[PDB]
């Protein structure tokens, strides 16, 4: 489910990346490894019974959601216009409550 | 042990399509090379364990396995259907093993 | 996130700057740049999270980010850095590292 | 570090035949030179240390090791005389590491 | 922290030398900087942290370094006997002064 969301942002961020000039290689490949990664974050907490895990998830997010100030703001040329910054960020917080709440879930199971 | 077999059989078939992934995929690709390989090391990490724990996390790469091939064949193409079917085949049969082999480690610990 | 705004700064100056370091450098020049972005998740796990330990590990991160500099100006065949642009985002690490100290202080409450 | 010296003659016969490796078969060729290297640190961490966790840490490398032979034999790339030899010395190194972890377990 | 600058004499010998070894070899070479330039965290870290372990991590850095020397002494022809000799002296530099402090936090304790 959350990885089913989480595609969504995969499939509009993915060709946002694919577009970053070799110019900008590295930050572009760390990029990247954020947003695929993310994949394997939530893959791993479901798979396992720690709640550190889930909070690393989150990390992981709130990270992505750097990127998306990077690529608009940081990296000249910029990557992202701030509508598809906004676009973005609204696919990754629909992720982000659901995340919220599976936390508050397995909290609540204390 | 025959989990490392059937696992290799899951190397034979996806390797050399994931090594004709377009280098304009170039960063998936290396991603998910260093993901099907690795995955080796998490299933003999798990063999010379008593931890359930690292049954689980093998199983998280197994689910990041597939995920690599749901991803890989929405791409615009590299993998062709049948491809994923195929791949999906060998990867369930080394799932059902792991998946015995977890659930007897917790018929075990009662 | 009043910290990794002002980290932001840090990293609009260095960014272009570390962009531009010769391909000679390629390892070294990498390996700057992870540590300039990384560094935000530094924050952010330490921001996601109540212990110090953590804040500890991206102060750190900032010492070794120094560390970058001081070598980056220093090296050779060819050159990389500049004793100005070292002087220069000092500045913008302290203000963070100012600002990581009021954070450090507010938690070991 | 009995081991690492040991060791030391798997990275000697390894390592030029790691190096010719074609780079059609680049990142298999990479993860397999950091398997191969990587293996000294491991050895290392153990032995600056008292957590047999590290040990085993090292027997898994050693493992992954024993995989990347089965993997460069089935891709020509390496001939099955090399693995032959490769084999020994990495059971030379595996044997060491038996004892030692045995030592560490008897209390 | 006369370590991490008594490091630093370590790096200033041995980083252009690393960098003068042939793309033939490009794996280890890199593998050989990402140890060497490396190690400045793991000293770093240890510093703002009390648990020995990461001493110990430290050692095992500087340990992994020299292994990197006979690596390359004998790459069949690519480090000099003399150019060997001379890090050995500057990380034993390095060495004598985690000893200490590594020795020192097993009184303290």
Redesign the interface.
């Known amino acids: 489910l959350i990885?089913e969301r989480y595609?969504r942002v995969?499939?509009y961020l993915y060709p946002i990346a694919?577009s970053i000039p070799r110019?900008?290689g590295?930050?572009?490949?760390?990029f990247?490894?954020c947003l695929?990664?993310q994949?394997?974050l939530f893959?791993?907490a479901?798979?396992?019974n720690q709640v550190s895990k889930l909070?690393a998830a989150?990390?992981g997010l709130?990270?992505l959601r750097?990127w998306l100030?990077?690529l608009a703001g940081?990296?000249?040329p910029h990557a992202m216009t701030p509508h598809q910054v906004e676009t973005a960020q609204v696919l990754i917080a629909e992720v982000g409550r659901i995340l919220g709440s599976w936390i508050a879930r397995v909290n609540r199971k204390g």
């Open positions: 990885v595609e995969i499939s694919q110019k900008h590295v930050a572009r490949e760390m990247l490894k695929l990664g994949v394997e893959i791993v479901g798979k396992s909070y989150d990390a709130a990270m750097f100030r990077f940081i990296q000249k």
